[model samples]
Target chain A: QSQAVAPVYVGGFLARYDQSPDEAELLLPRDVVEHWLSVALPLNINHDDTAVVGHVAAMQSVRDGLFCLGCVTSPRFLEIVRRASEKSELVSRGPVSPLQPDKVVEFLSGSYAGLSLSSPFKHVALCSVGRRRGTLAVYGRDPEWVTQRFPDLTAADRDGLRAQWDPFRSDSYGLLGNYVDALYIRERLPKLRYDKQLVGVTERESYVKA
Target chain B: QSQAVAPVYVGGFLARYDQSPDEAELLLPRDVVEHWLALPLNINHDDTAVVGHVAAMQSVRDGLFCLGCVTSPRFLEIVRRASEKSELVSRGPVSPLQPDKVVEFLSGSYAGLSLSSRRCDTTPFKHVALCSVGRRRGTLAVYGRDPEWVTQRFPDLTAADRDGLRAQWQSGDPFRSDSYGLLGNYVDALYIRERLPKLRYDKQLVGVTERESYVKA
Candidate 1:
């Protein structure tokens, strides 16, 4: 069980992008992809020595670009890669800027995890998309707005509701949507003078449990 | 064999000093020593973890103290009673830098000094002297091919200076022959490149020729 292996798609296009292209659209030249697989490289987390999690099992050129099938042997990191596949995006780095002078041969020598177009290119790994965005409820109403409609809710009550807000869930009322049943709030809050027409309160829950 | 225990000494006086005193002269009051040992405190290295227990402590000369530490549970009670009346002087901590030692930085710009010990065999580089610039400069005269690259970096030094320095290396005894081969290579390389600036003036206890007195009293 500890020696479980997981297949992870690593590497992307090592080409100049006039504008940042989507992950699927990126492509690497045939020769660049060929040279990258010429040397045996260890698959590591964030290019750190101690956290070497796996090995590059195979490499091939697809219609999109160069990517390697990495066998993640470490069970701990394998779980991280599994979670990242659903919530994060894959990125890579190389020796020279894709926009700058061509140095594909030098870039093929080493690989790193994380997104970069700079020199001393590293291999590709899962980068969290959540880290790029703000955690606060994006389409959330002000606390004053909630209190104005729901006069029954005192300042202390409002504070309690605010404490219950899980930013990850992006709940209705911008409060404890997960803890308090969503259907209960939708049907009961309007009767309690909680604003019926407010943006988040009437809307469906953004994150649903498995 | 693993369960066999040994008796060791631990703890010393914690007090300010007007002038630096030898380990023998430095003292802690009887009350402070008693209060320290009153509780069941574990003996540890750098206050990290329990290595043993504080068996007993006693004042050897005046208020100068020694702490008895033991691993055996049965011997602890007996040692505690024996320490109260015992007047014998036992060895304490083995640290060269005592609690009350005066140290001042030597004035001047200094660089790591490395010289070849064996002038005849320069190819294999069998021996070299690596000296660190401290209060009293200390040299680790070692026999190894490690410091050869460090010597190559300072090509500007005159042949006379190199020869004179080599003579000094031969006169001093080798601390450990070929023991620090890898360490000497890495440290001397970094020293010559000025990578370790802070370690250039590390305080060390060594003999010096001249004396500078700052205290008026």
Candidate 2:
């Protein structure tokens, strides 16, 4: 028992469901999301002190490898907000099945993965869905704040940058965007996962580093 | 456009970490552990699927409301473990810092609402630290594949079936010898707080419950 050198990041392979033989697209398994979400988020918080923006950035980077695992109705357990919400509908098992999103938002739908979840991509989808309802509200920091942060960012990435940083005009940007959407969604789902128990730490490592 | 309700679940709270608290004394943040791990585990995937036992059950049943909140790490960001092994070296940042238990153990450490983010009940805090090493081990299993399902024949709630069941030697039955020491460690360490994630569901009523003024279900 002298040596058992585990990989640096405890490498986990990316896998997906193959429900149908004809269905050529391969994705990760349910447990993949199950475990990644279970483990990764805290690492972001624990290691990076990252909040929303940071989480989105990091999750997508991780996604360069950890692509689509599978669809989860059980996942409603985490991301879905309490239904009865007027602004959003719970994608009742009826009209909405993540399994086939393009068919639902047919009018303005494209190959963008943002249509998958109303997460970070909510912004992109908002733009699309709102095209149907007029215009979406301007989000992110106030214009000046956006200018303050990214003086070089195009109107798309932030408020005042170089070129217009439309979030999803291409498949490349779309992948990164979809990745952030999933990460952000999982992170905010619910601290409820830890309900009924106050898990206060004695002393932790430290919340430093950029 | 007359109704707007959000799915809010039972949420956060945590235990104190100042003075040394024992495992049996450990508690958790609310709505965290129970709601997630609340589903009963079955033995061989058969009927009579009862809740054989539950871990962190004490925290769930705690008369005290100090458990289950979005407790923050006493510390912020520091590498707790980056190894394949569980090291056993003394920590140097707390009043009484603890040594490393091994690899990835700190992944489950709980956050104290009060600490300056270095050390607490068990962590060996270093200068300006805020992460913790805990005993949480997130396990996964399909609905019927879990090992703790209850049975009508042996309906008693015991630690043998529960995950990380607190080891209460005094209350432990000698017949369940295999679980004796481990159970004691659970209660003593209060692992329920860090390791467990809540998993349960509640039916929401729109109009039938009378809280509704609109006609929708």
Candidate 3:
């Protein structure tokens, strides 16, 4: 691996639904998914620090391509919440459908994607979905703050999220996911690192303007 | 009209999705939508908000239902096709969730745009106060609430179905109901209201207060 060539920004997206479309027993409305999606936007926290907004805004612009890619990725946040539920007094379902990665990728295709972001450190998309809500976290410079912000959000271990954000599952060359993924992949706007998880193509060669 | 009923805490429900079955779309899997409803135990921000946090443990058994079923021109187009394709089998024209009849759904400076106005445009100017209180746009009939009104507006719905919906809404105590199924519908109304622009009617049919009467229901 070479030295840092490009700065990265972590970005996130979050969506929540009131109902479930568990395939084994249920089916969802055709447009229900789309309507759920149209309501989605890049997840950003409004903090006392205005820099937080700028941090998100900057990422949205400079890392616009990656920003879009990350929005379409997911983390097994439900798994983590399930773990937390085991420990908490909260009444709930403790790990309902435990679909392995093989079965899950297609079964819940639109719900999760391989981690796509600049870097798990400087930037990483922490995508996690629980029963009624899902959160996509774009972390840049500071990820600890993200984990600590919301009580339920704290359950996700940063390194564990990093582990899932590994490269193999990601859209290598940015060819697999959403329309935004194509935008970045076609323009070569985001030079992706495929060593393991999806990261910004930070090679020095990528910075050299054509 | 009755005295404000006592408020009871209701929990929030959260569900996430990755993709849709339809082919004509942009892929967005990582996004999440959170539906939070609670009668806060404390009005202030410092309290244990978790106390009010709603979680549906076995609502998977609640069976399937549709939210955000409204009709605008673009909306009607999709519903029409979905119906024609027989993809939507349960309901018919002027269905319970479908647009019932035109009512003053939205009003404000931003209501100037026509019903067919594109949701997002190259020009950001269109977003100005669209429904958030700018200039008032004249009445644009939209569908929502008022069972008798909806029945009167759309002859399609059978009296039985209309009463079914009316009874459901009437029984849906905004403060006590275990399920806030109407939240998405609330979001849909707000979205439609944003687009309809300008309504001569001050109160529109696009909110729990106006559409479901959460306060009264």
Candidate 4:
């Protein structure tokens, strides 16, 4: 008798959001996607390098946003995927949600997460993806002032941002914009939502609100 | 009446080259250009003091090359120095003096005269005779002999001048004695010649002249 094998989870949308009155959707532009195609980006769990499961094999722009194809090779992530099929509760949805193997994945069809995480991970994983929508508004008003005021940011991160920042082009801001978003997320997330361990809330808002 | 104005040469390529197989052009990449846009670079002459700043740069030849706009207060100085350098480049290499042949006068008083080529004894103390071809009669005058003996032979020397010369010769300071009338501290000809270029650059001595080899009968 032959045993059944678990299918590999391949790819999904990296991030998806609608444009707001105050801000636009976070986008990984075509040129940036092209540049990243030439390089390999590690796929990590919750933006943690220690938990890297695979690498981003390919990336291309979709009508809704950016889509990435991942090559998940880690045994730990594979085991989780295998178990999650039987016990649906093992998988949870958040900023980055991976598609179940049975579900259909298409561009602009519906929201689905991938092994490729978002927030800091999306920006940190690729050199091309820069600041998010909310942070860019603050950055556009005063770039130097924004750079100086971010207390949570490291000196190295600040230097990296300053190196790529351009007042005229938001795309030139690079990792700087995302770093600012990370700062805001760190500060704002706890105040809005209770601890998952302590409190059980049915409806929870997005951690990142510009 | 209007005064004549020197034409302002506004721009020039910062660097230029043809592609080589062994080494490519040291290009300022586009991403690097984006970074520098936020900062200003001090334009220096011969890599010396900050003469001006070029805050702006633009990519020419489809992002292959970069050029800076000079917003300098001392623009005229930059123009002049660049022209001077260009002319220097067009003119062939400078012929520098060779060692062993070039003689430098270490002392100030004997600025025009050359040291005698004969080797000086450096035993108990540096004692070398200074002999120069007389400009008027083409005769050799050896001034290294005892001051008293020199005064006796050349009666034209006055009492005060001889006393001064004797005092200097007997003095402990070698520089004082060497710089005195018709005297020189013994130095290795080759060693001095080797350091001639550096000494000339520093403007340490009055000047140097060709060595005049001579001997006293």
Candidate 5:
């Protein structure tokens, strides 16, 4: 292809709403993941001997962007993540060994399930829309306006909404509209660490009931 | 020196901002800049190297942002050096200031990055700068604040120019009174070479931000 392949979400076009990585072989082009990783990483990182921690963090951020862009959320995508994580000699056999293949699989599986569920705070997602001017105020903290838009929201609900506003306003890199939803979720729930119990978890059955 | 410079507009603790290593510069480094030549030049550009180039572009934007905000000699030198290194100078207009440059002058900056990065409806750009002078200026005028009040804060901009900007923004209702107006005007001014007389004349260059302060009539 002459240009980079635009990331695609697998829905409506695909026969299934959510397919597992094993099902489709979930093969994403390596370059696309690498492209996003480059964007996320600091410009100063070493070419030959990149730090494994920073590489994984960049991978995590790009995964958020790709998910927003419509990449399928599955363990198959974890293959891309693991491949990216292993690129560092540090992960392969060096002194630093942050990424284990089995752990990468487990972490991604849990994340895919968590992401499938509806967001607890719908207002947070609504503010991501650029044109919906009022949503910004609601998410940013205008209780009067909040009452007008969502009267049913409780005082605690409104407070919960208000709490996140200041932090979001200060830090977000103008990330409204396109990628904010994924960013909000990622930050709200810090990445799940690998655990021994998570080994036998069934991805297909868990989200199906929800 | 160890901490990465926070992206452009973060205020407070100047000592920290100055000491932070230019994050974008470190990864791309100087050697990579010289070897890559002008373009990705190759169709099958190495994936990691391609990332390095893009990272360099963003780092350049971060540095350019500091230049945009204040007239610091260090920031100017950083921008000038990065501008000379990138291929931006070859493709686009070379400014009179830059002497036989490589990257397009001003194109590598945040103002110029959007046009360069567009590719196949992909992640043409990750971050468009959030800071804006016009939106900060509008705080006075948003809720019916008068033109007289605006000139008091922004003394450099002419009253007529201020009114003209307000008027231009008003026609495109519902007036957002947000950074988008300034950002749109800026994009048009740079890419389209359209009417941005408001931006062109004003020297204060105040954007809606932390150092931001305005009074209502």
Candidate 6:
């Protein structure tokens, strides 16, 4: 294929209604990932052999840790967590080993499952969305929104309802409606935007099943 | 010093953001940037020397394209056009080239400008993000949701608020609430999770001047 193969999700992500990695990821050529790390580890101006060796090792570490995008409960069609966004302070999550979400909720809430950032509190949530099979993600802390408006959407549901998802769904490149023309051609024409996941939330009930 | 750097973003990203030999990326401690090029880059699965070479090249790429952390905006980031909650599709910039944000009311919107699927359209959003500072990226076009309240709190302002910003004055990172504690700690913690750019939705605002003030400590 001319371009890199966009990633795909499976398992709960696949079963649930979700988006494709391409439409979701906008489909990148393999080299895009290549430039990121290359620019991240420069020791000196001259690319001496020593510097070169150091870069190689960094790549290995990056590969090992595929999980961890900006949002902990976020998914981008491909199951891997993003590394660049995590580096900045916008979201939080363990690079390689993160505590389970329930435990995270417990420690921060001073009690499990509460919606309050305690005073002098250091409650940080670094939710991540990876693909075991199809695509599944845990959105935000909105229980009422889910239980009341999306009741039929159920906790265990998995399907990328593109129609319903339009409002919440937008290109990752920029603001809303930025990619109308480009995306339309890429997704609708190529037909590579296969499959999807569904609506999700950070609610505990949203995580488990009966 | 011991490990290698990453290479995925440099070689893989779109044109404007490509890592140039002229630019110098920081070679993180060998233990730090080593994993930039995930599995299977190994040339001769048997010969480690060749594998080392492959790793070295990737690491250099990341270093070359490196932009200081949270210090500057990406070219892709600059091109982003602001949109409302109602619109369905939009894209962001990535890598060496970035998308810089216009100075205005930029706050935590739904999902901080990352990726996610939507049920309304019955299709997922096009994934987009860039990772380039010392490396290509840990980017993504993901699926997500933004609580309605957040939207109401930080509404989109089409006009420039430069005058308001100039009159009121911006505070220092030390005195700033958003700058300290959870937010600051999150950045440190994030270094481990993501690399140079940190969060995907994070923007580089150019004009918020900080007032000179002494700290208590």
**Chain B, TM-score, each prediction?**
0.21, 0.17, 0.21, 0.22, 0.21, 0.16
The parts of candidate 3 lying over 4 Å away from their true place are A1-210, B1-145, B153-155, B158-217
Using DockQ as the yardstick, the better of models 3 and 4 is 3
Candidate 4 lDDT, A64-144, residue by residue in tens = 334444444555433433322222211222222332223111100111111223442342232112233211111112233
Q: Sort every candidate by lDDT, greatest first.
A: 4, 1, 3, 5, 6, 2
Task: Report the C-alpha displacement of residue B131, candidate 4, in angstroms.
Answer: 99
Candidate 4 docking classification: incorrect
Give candidate 4 regions above 4 Å deviation: A1-7, A15-28, A35-37, A62-64, A80-210, B1-217
Give the per-residue Cα lDDT of candidate 4 at A85.
Answer: 27
lDDT of 1 by residue, B62-155 (tens): 2221122223333332223222222210111124422110000101111122221122211221211122221112211111111221122222
Residue-wise C-alpha lDDT for candidate 2, range B131-155, written one tens digit per residue: 1112211111111111222111111
* Cα lDDT computed for each candidate against the true fold: 0.24, 0.18, 0.22, 0.25, 0.21, 0.20
True-vs-predicted CA distance for residue A198, candidate 5, Å: 16
Say which candidate scores most in DockQ.
Answer: 6
DockQ of each: 0.02, 0.01, 0.01, 0.00, 0.01, 0.06
Who is ahead in lDDT, 1 or 6? 1
Clashing pairs in 1: A13-A27, A94-A121, A111-A122, A111-A123, A112-A122, A112-A123
User: Which TM-score value belongs to model 2?
Assistant: 0.18
Interface RMSD, one decimal, each candidate:
32.9, 19.8, 19.5, 38.1, 18.6, 14.9
Give the per-residue lDDT digits (tens) of candidate 4, residues B149-182.
Answer: 3233322334654454445334211121101111
Which stretches in model 1 have alpha-carbon errors above 4 Å?
A1-31, A35-38, A79-122, A129-210, B1-217
lDDT of 3 by residue, B1-217 (tens): 1111111111111111322312322111221111211112211111221112111111111111111112123222222222222211222222224422111112111122111112221321111111122122221222233334433332223465445445543412112311111111111122122222223232232211223311110
CAPRI accuracy category, model 1: incorrect
Model 1: how far residue A3 lies from native, Å: 9.8
Tens digits of per-residue lDDT, candidate 6, A162-197, equal 112101122232211221221112112112112121
Task: Write down the DockQ of candidate 5.
Answer: 0.01
Mind listing the fnat for each candidate? 0.00, 0.00, 0.00, 0.00, 0.00, 0.14
**Across residues A1-210, which tens digit of lDDT does each residue of candidate 1 receive?**
222223332322223222223344343345454465434455543333445555544433343233233434555444432222221111122112322211111111111211112112354332111111110111112323322332233465445334532002111111111111111112221221121222122212211000
